[PDB]
Amino acid sequence: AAREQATTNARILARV
Amino acid sequence: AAREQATTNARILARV
Amino acid sequence: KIEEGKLVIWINGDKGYNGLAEVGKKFEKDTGIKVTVEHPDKLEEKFPQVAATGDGPDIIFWAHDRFGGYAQSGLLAEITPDKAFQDKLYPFTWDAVRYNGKLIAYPIAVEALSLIYNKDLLPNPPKTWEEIPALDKELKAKGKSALMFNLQEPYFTWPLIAADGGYAFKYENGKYDIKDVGVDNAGAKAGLTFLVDLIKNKHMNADTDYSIAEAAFNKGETAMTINGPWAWSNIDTSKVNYGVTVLPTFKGQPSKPFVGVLSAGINAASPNKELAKEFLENYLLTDEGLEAVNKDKPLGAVALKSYEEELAKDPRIAATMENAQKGEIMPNIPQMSAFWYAVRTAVINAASGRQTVDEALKDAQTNAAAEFAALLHSLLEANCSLALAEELLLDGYSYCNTTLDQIGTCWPRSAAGALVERPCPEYFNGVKYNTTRNAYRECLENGTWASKINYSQCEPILD
Amino acid sequence: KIEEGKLVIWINGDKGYNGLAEVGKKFEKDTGIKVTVEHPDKLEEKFPQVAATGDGPDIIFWAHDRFGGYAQSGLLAEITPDKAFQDKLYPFTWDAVRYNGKLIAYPIAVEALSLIYNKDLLPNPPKTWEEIPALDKELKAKGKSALMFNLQEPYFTWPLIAADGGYAFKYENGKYDIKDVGVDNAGAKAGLTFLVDLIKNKHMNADTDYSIAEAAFNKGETAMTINGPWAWSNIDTSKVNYGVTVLPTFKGQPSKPFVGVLSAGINAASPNKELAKEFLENYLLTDEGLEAVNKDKPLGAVALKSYEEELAKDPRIAATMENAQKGEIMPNIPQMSAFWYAVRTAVINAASGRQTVDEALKDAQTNAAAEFAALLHSLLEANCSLALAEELLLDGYSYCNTTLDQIGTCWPRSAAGALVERPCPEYFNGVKYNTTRNAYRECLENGTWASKINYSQCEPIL
Amino acid sequence: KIEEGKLVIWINGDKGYNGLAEVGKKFEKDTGIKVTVEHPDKLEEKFPQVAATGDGPDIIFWAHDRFGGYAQSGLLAEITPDKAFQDKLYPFTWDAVRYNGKLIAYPIAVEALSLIYNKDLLPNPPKTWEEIPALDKELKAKGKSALMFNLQEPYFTWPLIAADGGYAFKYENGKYDIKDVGVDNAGAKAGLTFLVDLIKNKHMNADTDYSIAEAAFNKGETAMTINGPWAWSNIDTSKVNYGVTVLPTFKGQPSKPFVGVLSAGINAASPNKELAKEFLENYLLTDEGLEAVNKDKPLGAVALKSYEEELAKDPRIAATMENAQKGEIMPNIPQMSAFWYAVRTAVINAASGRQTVDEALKDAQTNAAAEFAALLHSLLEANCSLALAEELLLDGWGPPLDPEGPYSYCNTTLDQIGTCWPRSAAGALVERPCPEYFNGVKYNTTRNAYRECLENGTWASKINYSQCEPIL
Amino acid sequence: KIEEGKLVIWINGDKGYNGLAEVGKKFEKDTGIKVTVEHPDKLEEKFPQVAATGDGPDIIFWAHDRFGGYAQSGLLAEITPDKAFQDKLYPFTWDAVRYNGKLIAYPIAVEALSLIYNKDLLPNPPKTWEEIPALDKELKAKGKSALMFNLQEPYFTWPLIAADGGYAFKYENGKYDIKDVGVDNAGAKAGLTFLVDLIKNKHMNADTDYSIAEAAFNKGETAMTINGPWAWSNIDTSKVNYGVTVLPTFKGQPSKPFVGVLSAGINAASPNKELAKEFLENYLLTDEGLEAVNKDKPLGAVALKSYEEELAKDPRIAATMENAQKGEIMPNIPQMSAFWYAVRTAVINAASGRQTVDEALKDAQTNAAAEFAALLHSLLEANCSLALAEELLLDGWGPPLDPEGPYSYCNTTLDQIGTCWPRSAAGALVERPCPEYFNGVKYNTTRNAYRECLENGTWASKINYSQCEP
Ligand SMILES: OC[C@H]1O[C@H](O[C@H]2[C@H](O)[C@@H](O)[C@@H](O)O[C@@H]2CO)[C@H](O)[C@@H](O)[C@@H]1O
Ligand SMILES: OC[C@H]1O[C@H](O[C@H]2[C@H](O)[C@@H](O)[C@@H](O)O[C@@H]2CO)[C@H](O)[C@@H](O)[C@@H]1O
Ligand SMILES: OC[C@H]1O[C@H](O[C@H]2[C@H](O)[C@@H](O)[C@@H](O)O[C@@H]2CO)[C@H](O)[C@@H](O)[C@@H]1O
Ligand SMILES: OC[C@H]1O[C@H](O[C@H]2[C@H](O)[C@@H](O)[C@@H](O)O[C@@H]2CO)[C@H](O)[C@@H](O)[C@@H]1O
């Protein structure tokens, strides 16, 4: 999903 | 397209 | 090697070639010059293959859209009709054969697709694409069907794809913008989705091609077909009571057929250019010349003023022109080749279910706009400028300056009098080349690049 | 929000979850701590979705391959077993749950696919994939078929794609090379072509999935299937006289199943980490713990030394291990996610005839190696170097130097003490963002970039 | 895209363009073909920029030196006058418009700089550059000055730089040796040193440009100027009693002006080539055609035999030709463009004191100014190509775009200032920060430039740079 | 990829590395862990190149100034000594290895330059730089020379450049002001002028480097040298009767050497961090461990309290510490790298007469050397990234590639010399023309460099530049 991929990105962006 | 686009290409490479 | 003292003519097998051979017979009685008329398969593809070698027909017949691509490759001879002959033909038909200001073919006739319908099965043909589904359901119950036309050639479905806003190349400021392709917009999607849905819903079959469609209609098995003026002849023989009318609307918008101009171009390699000019001007573009062809297979709206004034009466010709007016004359640019092949693929793939409509038309956009090449090009442009930057930086009188030729080789800054070698490009026009071979270009003693670049050593990589 | 004072456990519906709930029942008697076992659909995809928000199970069960991607996203708690507990399990099972030197899950059992065959229909199962066509012809004449297995999950056809040289990520120098993907080589093409041909020749059906295959086999309708240890239980019930054997060879090469290690990871957001550790170490990883689950659905070769020594006798376990040895342990890297999705698509598309084998596997190659990303990256790298060149040229004392962060933003040369803004990246990990929003990074007073980059304002386009 | 059925003509703003429009007016009466005469700033740099894209004027007017580079780049159409027409013009004027054996333009008139002096302030103009300092001191005491001329265009100081031995490209065996440049020799150094000294000694001002000099001379404030025939018209109006004479010597040697031949070239991309030829041959290159332009601003010694035989009488034309003879016809080779840019920078830098004479001319010899301009430029070119690459990649192979979001964009381009305009939606007004550097000048980057992406998916041709200021 | 279960150690070739290998030999006896001591050329530049890829030594030894940049770049593992261990070493030595409040290396020894002189040729070494010219004239008459020392490393000339007012970064309020650089002030200019003048007047030679100076001093050919404690060992062997004394003053002011603390850092990527710690704490930082290394090449004033109390006696150590006091502990900030590169270029250019003292130091102030290197470098970087782009584009989205070509390639990369190695088939030996420019030196481009793409699709780590000449 483009839903699943966006929220999992949100993690890496909170991280970095 | 494979053999004939190579024919078309040779003409171009000749004039140039 | 074309024969001297005769004329070989190529025209499509759907057109009035026996009529043409009659005009060729009159030419032969008169001049003693044997005229042979042939109709090979895939002639629009064979011509540039064989003509590339100084071979093929003396004259070629096709719709103008391919002729730009031909003239560009230097395959067509420039035609030289006087003022008086130009007045005999409609100005807009000349416009369609003008490439780079040069006239590159003789216009013969204007062709547009129309709705052809069986008056006994359907006395009232639908005004809209949207009624067709329900109409097919009514007819299936009578063991018939509503509509069959060639689904293998993008020419036939185009009118529907264009109806709600799909377009080939955006026209503005007297120029087609080849970076602006309209094959993947909302309109195009809507049009193609309707077609695919007709198929999913079994109102049409994805296998349906020209002969299947023509045979079914002329046998009274299908109520409607989409075809051009050349097809009317066979319907006359079949005795089907047929009408020719305006194409159905889609989303309230008129169907927009790509209008063709049948055209006669002279092979640039032909030793018989005068004979061909004689034949086309004094024999074919006469009322008798045109009438002979039209009586074999109807030409549509002919380019010759004096004969069109007679055909204009025929309500079938009237319908042709109304469909032509709602559509658009085809661009004649070389990129038309790539456009058609991309749309062919999109439609076939979408219809078979190999790809959804969105995937199919995306690829179509990417193909038609040579976007892979634009992207590659700009990389080679970036790289070549970098090569210049490094040179200048390290540097800090008279060289040939860094350039990038139209093949994608970056010629570095070089000394006057140097013969420069670069590896052959890895990719050019959809073909890969052996990069262990070199191209060669001379930097002249006067600090300017030789205009000719030796690319003789660059071989394709093949299977 | 996970509940404090209980344990919620997720495991796959094909595994021994009722056995697990029994171990959970023993835990509850002892500690008074209610243990709930659930089996949601697509759990390996739901977990990272819900865990991302401080929600989901306390413990998660899956093969180790997904766990690297979980640990990377910071969703798994680090596990802390003592020396004595580590000796109780095989070293190679711990290796499979090690990410970045940290242990991120408990190994439970080793799973490999095997050939399962009906001894009454086929007393002598084929030694090679190549005999299967003819074998299917013999059996169609008896109203049966040769072979049915799940064609919807790449896990099952992989053994055959790998047989003649296909591979996921190339291993060498203790590292998986994520730029070297072997999904589109001669071997992979050969393997997938054979599978597609079986289907074209109507020896298999492209629709065939897990339940279709399982039901056909257990009903005596097909002679052979490909499945794991969890499947044997149902065959026992069905009374089919079955064998479990070595997978057939392809072009003389052994089939190479991707070996899994079923593993238990603790949710980083769970407030019940001690309870989970206590459950896994003192209840599940015991002979009684494992036996309870294994008696529901067989685990395969268990990670616990003392219980595996008993299961090792079972020729079905022996077969499992022989197939495991001819295959390869799955990588646990985060890229496994993208690899499986690419291969799923390739196999489905090639099987259905949407794409040829060549087209399908080409697209798989490009997806699995994230080439769109490598290509894009090197453009951003080029561009950021140019921005530096221009600065330096125009220039000709203490700045933060131009860098490119791992998201693809090029931070230009900036003065000490400056808060720098750049537009949000247009593309990141298959997602497009609104570029009219900015990211923010500080250039510290000491001429070094702050390590944290504020990306809080970058929204996806949905 | 040049308009079919009309003629657009570009000529420099200092020449007789209203005269030319009159000839255009006669052409329109006769043929019905509308003739538009324009005079854009920096037209000799604009032409190769716009003509490179099948755009620009039908006919371009400049001195022949720039035409070789134009022809080389394929921007000029080959001209085909018949024998009879060629006999109507002087052979040496055709020589100047010959490139690669092909004729690439029509010669109009020969231009050389001369000394123009005020007869009331100076009855006897100096014979030598060396007497000018003393002469200025005599005149500063009368609230006047000795000499003012354009210090911003190398064309004006060249005669003095060449006098004692400076040269562009060495000519021999019918060829210019592009490896033999005479911009840094003893002679060139001496000439430029004298000029820099006049400035150091406050007999001239480094700032002085074409308007300042012209206004000062025509107002009777300076005794002498250096200019060409086009300048006489405004002096006539100003009623200053002026003479036109031989340029002063330097170290005994004549000043050596670079002689220009004003020429008319046809754009290779023009669809009106026949019309252009008719206009040039049958309307302009006639006594009436030339006289119309000459009465607006004098042309100099015209290329047309029959009309030159009347102008030859004029002692001002006699002076023009004497200076022309002591100078040298300009090369037309493509390298002239880099030569002029190098000498422009050398003169400006030496005059302003940014560099010593030695340093300035050394860089002129190295071609260091052009090379640097070219370094920065190719970085900006590379960068804008990359921006394009990224757009195209994302567009074609990136995740599915917005169904409802727009369809046709203006594509990433770099304008001639160095601003990279990003891919933008049709109808959008796009801002970019003002460039940090342009033509040796730094600007305030916190201000923006503005450009419109038209509704048709093409960029507006005009770019708004009005807000970009230079800060020191 | 560093090997698990052993220790690889990098130290400079001028230090007591055989001493260190003995300590490694004892560690191996006890633990079974093989310890390899290596001494690569330009190790302080090689380490951040190779460590940046999870490669390189387990332990790196250098003076502390380079460690701040390493820790910044994330290449060093934070060290965790306990209270008792920290009490064993001098507090000021721990200060030197502190970066961002974390301890990033183990201090080993304090290093300062001193004047080393030949007692037979000079019984009374000069007190001042100014007397050296006259002194050289007296000695040239005996077929000898006054002074020789390494002119190729800014570390050696710094004491004199700093003497009258030159400084690296201004220190105040507990911080180095990176905006306040004292490389182009009056003092710095005076110092470098004096040095350039010695050369103009033929009392020294621009070419003089570490070997030349050492060999000349140890052979009794020059009366004085400038060097650190590591150099005493070879002098002992050479049997020159030498003294170690205070550096000469300049315009009355003491010479101000930049004091180094030789330090041991653990690679952040090393899988043997515990072994490294054991080795450093329990084997090296002991009287025996230090004594073993010191007996090979003297360390200077060691960081370990108990051993330094024995070395403190030695007047050579006393001189080391006196010079150290008149000097200044080096900053460890990441900008030290650019600072040294700038001062290296300034000294070389001024010494060879390529630039005046004023021009050289102006460029040092401006950081013009490191900026030009960075300009060229980023162009080469951009270019090799583009070549990569093109390969990837063609590979993925280009016409169906060779079904029977090879499958696995070595990818386009740029090595640290600036050569862009193109995409190449596994097993291929690839040629590229020698780079046109490298470190201010031009080469003959018609010769080739060579690199192997290994059968596994990886590049060989070693690149053959042997054929590249100027
Ligand atoms: O289908 C793409 C095709 O369309 C046109 O060809 C037409 C042609 O214009 C008609 O005269 C008739 O023969 O039907 C053809 C459709 O098959 C374009 O002229 C051609 O370029 C293009 O390939
Ligand atoms: O189908 C791709 C899938 O393969 C593996 O999943 C296995 C799992 O390991 C087994 O425990 C069992 O449940 O069968 C699954 C196949 O459905 C990978 O573990 C998984 O990541 C991947 O999606
Ligand atoms: O200053 C360099 C410039 O010199 C010449 O330009 C002259 C032109 O010839 C005259 O017609 C008159 O307009 O003044 C110009 C100087 O402003 C060259 O023709 C030109 O190419 C060159 O750049
Ligand atoms: O020359 C600049 C250089 O000086 C110092 O390096 C010293 C090192 O500290 C000493 O132990 C000895 O080996 O001599 C070296 C000079 O070659 C700095 O520590 C170093 O970072 C700097 O580049």
Q: Could you give the CA distance from residue E445 to residue F298 in angstroms, rounded to a whole number? A: 58
Q: Could you give the CA distance from residue F58 to residue F192 in angstroms, rounded to a whole number? A: 39
Q: Could you give the CA distance from residue C324 to residue C246 in angstroms, rounded to a whole number? A: 10
Structure tokens at F35: 């310890």
Q: Could you give the CA distance from residue F255 to residue D335 in angstroms, rounded to a whole number? A: 58
Structure tokens at E101: 């054996």
Query: For the residues of F359-374, what is the DSSP string, one character each?
Result: HHHHHHHHTHHHHHHH
Q: Identify the CA nearest to E107 among candidates E301, E282, E276.
A: E301
Cα D27 off chain centre by: 29
CB C423 within 8 A of CB C435: yes
Tell whether C263 is covered by a domain: yes
- Amino acid, single-letter form, for residue F192: L
Burial of E148 from C-beta contacts in 10 A (0-12 / 13-18 / 19+) = buried
Neighbours of E375 (CB within 10 A): 23
- The CATH number of whichever domain residue C41 belongs to comes to 3.40.190.10
Please indicate whether, in this complex, the C-beta atoms of A5 and D430 are within 8 angstroms of each other.
yes
CA D345 / ligand 2 centre spacing (Å)? 15
Q: Could you give the CA distance from residue D111 to residue D317 in angstroms, rounded to a whole number? A: 10
* Whether residues C102 and C130 fall in one domain: no
Structure tokens at F324: 């150290």
Q: Which ligand has the nearest atom to the CA of E44?
A: 3
Residue nearest to atom 3 of ligand 4 (CA): F155
Tell whether D376 is covered by a domain: no
* Whether residues F335 and F214 fall in one domain: yes
- Amino acid, single-letter form, for residue C383: N
Q: Could you give the CA distance from residue C401 to residue C415 in angstroms, rounded to a whole number? A: 9
* Whether residues D2 and D53 fall in one domain: yes
Cite the DSSP H helix spans in F201-333. Answer: 210-218, 232-238, 273-278, 287-294, 305-311, 315-326
Instruction: Give the C window 33-72 contacts with D, CB below 8 Å.
Output: none
* Whether residues E345 and E222 fall in one domain: yes
Angle of helix F368-397 relative to helix F357-366, nearest 10 degrees, comes to 50
Between C and D, how many residue pairs show a Cβ–Cβ distance under 8 A? 6
**Smallest CA–CA distance from F404 into chain D, residue:** D186
Residue showing tokens 């308007």: E211
Please indicate whether, in this complex, the C-beta atoms of E396 and C448 are within 8 angstroms of each other.
no
**Smallest CA–CA distance from D378 into chain C, residue:** C379
With an 8 Å Cβ cutoff, the interface of chain D facing chain A consists of: 45, 48-49, 52, 73-74, 405-407, 428-431, 452-453, 455-456, 458, 460, 462
Tell whether C392 is covered by a domain: no
* Whether residues E101 and E183 fall in one domain: no
Angle of helix E186-200 relative to helix E357-366, nearest 10 degrees, comes to 140
**Smallest CA–CA distance from C434 into chain F, residue:** F402
Q: Could you give the CA distance from residue F317 to residue F294 in angstroms, rounded to a whole number? A: 12
User: Nearest C-alpha of chain B: how many angstroms from C331?
Assistant: 21
Query: For the residues of C289-324, what is the DSSP string, one character each?
Result: HHHHHHTTS--SEESBHHHHHHHTTSHHHHHHHHHH
Ligand 2 site residues (CB inside 6 A) read D 12, 14, 44, 63, 65-66, 111, 153-155, 260, 340
Q: Identify the CA nearest to C420 among candidates C401, C435, C406.
A: C401
Q: Could you give the CA distance from residue F196 to residue F306 in angstroms, rounded to a whole number? A: 44
Residue C167 CA neighbour count, 13 Å, CB half: 18
* Ligand 4 and F423: CB distance under 6 A: no
Radius of gyration of chain E (CA): 24
Contact list in A for residue D406 (CB cut-off 8 A) is: 16
Cα D98 off chain centre by: 14
SS3 category, C135? helix
* Whether residues D12 and D45 fall in one domain: yes
Q: Could you give the CA distance from residue C181 to residue C364 in angstroms, rounded to a whole number? A: 10
Tell whether C336 is covered by a domain: yes
* Whether residues C167 and C144 fall in one domain: no
User: Nearest C-alpha of chain B: how many angstroms from C48?
Assistant: 8
Q: Could you give the CA distance from residue C336 to residue C330 in angstroms, rounded to a whole number? A: 9
Angle at C176 between CA C174 and CA C182, to 5 degrees: 135
- Amino acid, single-letter form, for residue F267: N
Q: Could you give the CA distance from residue D293 to residue D289 in angstroms, rounded to a whole number? A: 7
Radius of gyration of chain B (CA): 7
Positive/negative CA dihedral, E54, E56, E57, E61? negative
Q: Could you give the CA distance from residue C343 to residue E393 in angstroms, rounded to a whole number? A: 21
* Whether residues C120 and C249 fall in one domain: yes
Q: Which ligand has the nearest atom to the CA of D341?
A: 2
Q: Could you give the CA distance from residue E260 to residue E108 in angstroms, rounded to a whole number? A: 10
Residue D196 makes CB contacts below 8 A (sequence gap 6+) with: D350, D351, D357
Residue C355 makes CB contacts below 8 A (sequence gap 6+) with: C349, C363, D354
Whole-Å CA distances, C186 to C162, C197, C346, D330, F417? 11, 16, 15, 44, 53
Structure tokens at D390: 């221009």
User: Nearest C-alpha of chain C: how many angstroms from E279?
Assistant: 21
Characterise D252 by phi-psi region: left (phi > 0), alpha (psi -120 to 50), beta (else).
Answer: left
CB D57 within 8 A of CB D267: yes
**Smallest CA–CA distance from D430 into chain A, residue:** A5
Number of separate domains in chain D: 4
Q: Identify the CA nearest to F126 among candidates F31, F247, F268.
A: F247
* Whether residues E178 and E302 fall in one domain: no
CB F49 within 8 A of CB F260: no
Residue showing tokens 């046109």: F436
Phi, psi of E361 (to 5 degrees): -75, -30
* Whether residues D120 and D249 fall in one domain: yes
- Amino acid, single-letter form, for residue E12: N
User: Nearest C-alpha of chain B: how many angstroms from C9?
Assistant: 22
Tell whether C72 is covered by a domain: yes
- Amino acid, single-letter form, for residue D190: A
Positive/negative CA dihedral, D29, D32, D38, D44? negative
* β-bridge partners, E115: E226, E245
* Whether residues D227 and D355 fall in one domain: no
SS3 category, E24? helix
Q: Identify the CA nearest to C67 among candidates C79, C81, C85.
A: C79
SS3 category, F312? coil
Parallel/antiparallel/unpaired status of strands E175-182 and E222-227: unpaired
Q: What is the 3-state secondary structure (H, E, C) of chain D?
A: CCCCCCEEEECCCCCCHHHHHHHHHHHHHHHCCCEEEECCCCHHHHHHHHHCCCCCCCEEEEEHHHHHHHHHCCCECCCCCCHHHHCCECHHHHHHCEECCEECCEEEEEECCEEEEECCCCCCCCCEHHHHHHHHHHHHCCCCEEECCCCCCHHHCHHHHHHCCCEEEEEECCEEEEEEEECCCHHHHHHHHHHHHHHHCCCCCCCCCHHHHHHHHHCCCEEEEEECHHHHHHHHHHCCCEEEECCCEECCECCCCEEEEEEEEEECCCCCHHHHHHHHHHHHCCHHHHHHHHCCCCCCEECEHHHHHHHCCCHHHHHHHHHHHHCEECCCCCCHHHHHHHHHHHHHHHHHCCCCHHHHHHHHHHHHCCHHHHHHHHHHHHHHHHHHHHHHHHHCCCEECCEECCCCCEECCEECCCEEEEECCCEECCEEECCCCEEEEEECCCCCECCCCECCCCCECC
DSSP state of E295: T
Structure tokens at E256: 């050596």
Residue F265 makes CB contacts below 8 A (sequence gap 6+) with: F59, F60, F61, F62, F67, F70, F76, F77, F104, F105, F106
Domain that holds residue E425: 367-472
* Whether residues F142 and F202 fall in one domain: yes
- Amino acid, single-letter form, for residue C125: P
User: In the complex, which subunits touch D with 3 or more CB pairs below 8 angstroms?
Assistant: A, C, E, F
Q: Identify the CA nearest to F348 among candidates F154, F160, F187, F213.
A: F154
DSSP state of F306: H
CA E6 / ligand 3 centre spacing (Å)? 28
Phi, psi of E217 (to 5 degrees): -65, -45
CA C113 / ligand 1 centre spacing (Å)? 11
Q: Could you give the CA distance from residue C123 to residue C135 in angstroms, rounded to a whole number? A: 13
